Point group: D2
Chain length 106, copies 4
Amino acid sequence: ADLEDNMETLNDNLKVIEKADNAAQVKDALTKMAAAAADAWSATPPKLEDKSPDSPEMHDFRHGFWILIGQIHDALHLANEGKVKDAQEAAEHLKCTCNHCHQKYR
Amino acid sequence: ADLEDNMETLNDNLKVIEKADNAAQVKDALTKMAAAAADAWSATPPKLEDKSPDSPEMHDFRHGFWILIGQIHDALHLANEGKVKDAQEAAEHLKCTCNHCHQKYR
Amino acid sequence: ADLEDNMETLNDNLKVIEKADNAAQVKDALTKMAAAAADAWSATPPKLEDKSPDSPEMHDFRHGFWILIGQIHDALHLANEGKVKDAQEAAEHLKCTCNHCHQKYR
Amino acid sequence: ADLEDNMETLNDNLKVIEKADNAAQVKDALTKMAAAAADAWSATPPKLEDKSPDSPEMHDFRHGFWILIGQIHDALHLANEGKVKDAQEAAEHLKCTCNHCHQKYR
Ligand code: HEC
Ligand code: HEC
Ligand code: HEC
Ligand code: HEC
Ligand SMILES: [Cl-]
Ligand SMILES: [Cl-]
Ligand SMILES: [Cl-]
Ligand SMILES: [Cl-]
Ligand SMILES: [Cl-]
Ligand SMILES: [Cl-]
Ligand SMILES: [Cl-]
Ligand SMILES: [Cl-]
Ligand SMILES: [Cl-]
Ligand SMILES: [Cl-]
Ligand SMILES: [Cl-]
Ligand SMILES: [Cl-]
Ligand SMILES: [Zn+2]
Ligand SMILES: [Zn+2]
Ligand SMILES: [Zn+2]
Ligand SMILES: [Zn+2]
Ligand SMILES: [Zn+2]
Ligand SMILES: [Zn+2]
Ligand SMILES: [Zn+2]
Ligand SMILES: [Zn+2]
């Protein structure tokens, strides 16, 4: 899918984790996020179209998605060990990877 | 020194790193931050006075300061290897430890 | 492929990185390692056959492979930025994930 | 104290954590280790006497001690939350910082 599509899958799903009553609402949401950042890894932002697919500025942009995946990964372990509030908090710490990518490439 | 004193040493010094023209302005600033978070480690917040000095909520609050110190530490290595922009960016990533402590204990 | 097959793909390829004269010998090798640990993630060790596929002892065993993948990942960035010795060193730091899995599950 | 003194405080205390029956034997030991690596931070190895106190090879050697301190730090939190086996395991993962310093500077 489209990048904006991915980003709007991430954002609308983080709200969901935040106002969640259910573990399986967090767990579900984080999986869609994981799959959206997986898709978004192989994707070129407006601000780096002119930069090479081997650009360091493109490596770093993709590794922002690599970090987000791992952060989401450890969040999914916590939801699966029953720690629903811990998970939501892991989920809230996503936003700093989110903003790191935005400030530097949006 | 007082906690608010420390926090207002941190904040007013992060602005300084952000609008900095000099390496030694970043390097200087980060050292005052380091020393302010060092002081603030041994300090009780309003919201945990009633909680024990061995409280897990007090351990975690102090370990927020432990993380910030290390983050500031790696920022000082970068300023000392000449990487002034890298440093400022390390400095900008402080804000997520900052907000993590605030959301949960301010 | 088989687990032992994977492990013997990892080991024989780490020797290769260590006595390497070429960047593309490190880079090549690390990719086979990456693919071998990817395969080995979805695999059951002798010592946990009786433990559930949702066992915490099986989660942790799989997350050992998750850590190794990321370690190998950052090793591949370094080989691709020209830092062939840095890479080999990243490669040498694999062995502690290697032994952590072995001591606890071999 | 002397570096060898520190190193022989670390080693003889890691054995102690490993064959420990008591939490306060782990907790005690890790504190002596912490204090020994604190001392050893401000210390020059034989192999870098000729290198500058601002050498990158001397920065990295000292930051090896910085990493070890944090590793020991998180080990002490676990001993203080009652997780005596977790602690011993944290303690066993020290050895890779230990060997990283040795291979490169002993
Ligand atoms: C890069 C590695 C990114 C990470 C990590 C995250 N985001 Fe992102 N985001 C990124 C870009 C390049 C853009 C701009 C898209 C455009 O072409 O305009 C965005 C944008 C958003 C948006 C707005 C979408 C739009 O219509 O402009 C949202 C709502 C958004 N991003 C959310 C978001 C969330 C919730 C993240 C983490 C959980 C996150 N982003 C990480 C690049 C990257
Ligand atoms: C805990 C581990 C904290 C970390 C890390 C940071 N801050 Fe903080 N901050 C903390 C508390 C408990 C408070 C409330 C103080 C009070 O008694 O009201 C604060 C407050 C601030 C403030 C406002 C001070 C005030 O007058 O209320 C600022 C400006 C501030 N903090 C800044 C700040 C910065 C810049 C940080 C990182 C670089 C940071 N804080 C981290 C607790 C903790
Ligand atoms: C688990 C998460 C592991 C990680 C990470 C690594 N290894 Fe491993 N290894 C693992 C198991 C369960 C076993 C036993 C296989 C058996 O059924 O006997 C092994 C074994 C090996 C072996 C020996 C293979 C054999 O014939 O017994 C080697 C040579 C080996 N492992 C190498 C290796 C290397 C080089 C690693 C990191 C780079 C590594 N392993 C990580 C489980 C896990
Ligand atoms: C550097 C950052 C180091 C870390 C981290 C650790 N060690 Fe070390 N160790 C270091 C040096 C430079 C030396 C050589 C001392 C000499 O002058 O010969 C050592 C040596 C040891 C020794 C042997 C002491 C001797 O008589 O030669 C031991 C037993 C030892 N180190 C143990 C040790 C342990 C247990 C560590 C982690 C828990 C560890 N070291 C880390 C430098 C560094
Ligand atoms: Cl991917
Ligand atoms: Cl990447
Ligand atoms: Cl899952
Ligand atoms: Cl301190
Ligand atoms: Cl702490
Ligand atoms: Cl300094
Ligand atoms: Cl996988
Ligand atoms: Cl996993
Ligand atoms: Cl690659
Ligand atoms: Cl120190
Ligand atoms: Cl250091
Ligand atoms: Cl202690
Ligand atoms: Zn990457
Ligand atoms: Zn950034
Ligand atoms: Zn701590
Ligand atoms: Zn938090
Ligand atoms: Zn995992
Ligand atoms: Zn282990
Ligand atoms: Zn350091
Ligand atoms: Zn090393």
